[PDB]
Amino acid sequence: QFTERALTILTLAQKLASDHQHPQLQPIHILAAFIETPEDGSVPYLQNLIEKGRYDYDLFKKVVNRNLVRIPQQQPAPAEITPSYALGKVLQDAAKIQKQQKDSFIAQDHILFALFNDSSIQQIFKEAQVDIEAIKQQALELRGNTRIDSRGADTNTPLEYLSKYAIDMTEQARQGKLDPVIGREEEIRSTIRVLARRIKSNPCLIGEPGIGKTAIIEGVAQRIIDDDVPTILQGAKLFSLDLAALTAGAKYKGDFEERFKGVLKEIEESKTLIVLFIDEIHMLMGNGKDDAANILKPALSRGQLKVIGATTNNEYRSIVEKDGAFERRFQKIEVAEP
């Protein structure tokens, strides 16, 4: 059985073949599936690998597409897509590779490596001036010692869940999408000092929801980019948790928790510091909601999760009363009306 992501690649591969007028599914359709631009703004598994190796990805897409239109299109298109000879070899090759790595499932990793054995794929790569061997090293670099023992272990990038369910504010500040903050110099400076602490290094902005707490977070993100922060915060990423994105699409039981776990995992296992801002932390922390709290609280206790919280005075006092460990983990910062 394939992974969730690998199955998606295969499904999209034949979907592309169906979009075109090709009767047979070929290896190039899988390659085209890998470079397919997702609508969720995620970074495709193969895109990351190619542009991580300092290769030209735009050129690569052009070659693949010009090779996908090069093959004849059947005007009397039949309602049946049978796998070609080359494809069958690839799929079988992917099963061999996953068994050699003692993986539990056939991931997009194995499929990619199987494509590298195909003649047409190799010719495409050589035509796109992209060295397959260098790409192989990237994939090995990405996965590392991580075994595919689950149907969702073959994540595309180390920031897949963060890119889907959170907003990179540091990137937004760098891209010039954030308006400059005015009159919050003290709150901004206080939030930064706390983040740079050793003990109780998690800021929690306290105030009425009718105030601009997110402005402070934007200010902090801008300071980080300009290196106007202590050395420990330099080069850090500041993400804002998007609760709306988390629940959107989550139609099954346990779907929310899986997405939340995926986000926290990418943060805790990140080589570079990542700060997570949670606008309504009491909706995920307070005694009223212990479902998502059983995910966030253990993560915070492991000490590899730096979080900027935001809540009201009444709600803050509520979480404190229910759990006295919150006071030792979070440093309250009052935000008043300017």
Residue numbers in the entry: 6 to 343
Sentences from the paper on this structure:
Members of the ring-forming Hsp104/ClpB family of ATP-driven molecular chaperones are the principle protein disaggregases in fungi (Hsp104), plants (Hsp101), and eubacteria (ClpB). At the molecular level, Saccharomyces cerevisiae Hsp104 forms a homo-hexamer that is stabilized by adenine nucleotides. Each Hsp104 monomer features two ATP-binding domains, termed AAA-1 and AAA-2, in addition to an N-terminal (N) domain and a coiled-coil motif that mediates the physical interaction with Hsp70. It is now widely accepted that Hsp104 facilitates the unfolding of aggregated proteins and the threading of substrate through the protein translocation channel analogous to ATP-dependent Clp proteases.
Here we present the orthorhombic crystal structure of an N-terminal fragment of S. cerevisiae Hsp104 (Hsp1041-360) comprising the N domain (residues 4–164), the AAA-1large domain (residues 165–341), and the first α-helix of the AAA-1small domain (residues 345–356). The structure of Hsp1041-360 was determined by molecular replacement and was refined to a resolution of 2.6 Å. We did not observe any unaccounted electron density that could be attributed to a bound nucleotide, even when 5 mM nucleotide (ADPNP or ADP) was added for crystallization, indicating that Hsp1041-360 was crystallized in the nucleotide-free state. The crystal structure consists of three Hsp1041-360 monomers (mol 1, mol 2, and mol 3) that are structurally independent and in different physicochemical environments, which allows the identification of common structural features that may be of functional importance. Superimposing the crystal structures of the complete Hsp1041-360 fragment through their AAA-1large domain shows that the orientation of the N domain seen in mol 1 and mol 2 is rotated by 172–174° relative to that in mol 3 with residues 161–165 making up the hinge region. The first AAA-1 pore loop (loop-1), comprising residues 253–259, is seen in all three monomers, and loop-2, comprising residues 291–294, is ordered in two molecules. In our structure, Tyr257 makes contact with the N domain of a neighboring, non-crystallographic symmetry (NCS) related molecule. In addition, the aliphatic side chain of Lys256 forms a stacking interaction with the Tyr257 side chain, which may orient Tyr257, while the ε-amino group of Lys256 makes an ionic interaction with the Glu146 side chain of a neighboring molecule. In our structure, loop-2 adopts two distinct conformations in an ‘up’ and ‘down’ configuration when viewed along the six-fold axis of the Hsp104 hexamer. Residue 292 (asparagine) that is non-conserved in ClpA/B proteins, is in van der Waals contact with the N domain of an NCS-related, neighboring molecule (Lys131), resembling an interaction with substrate.
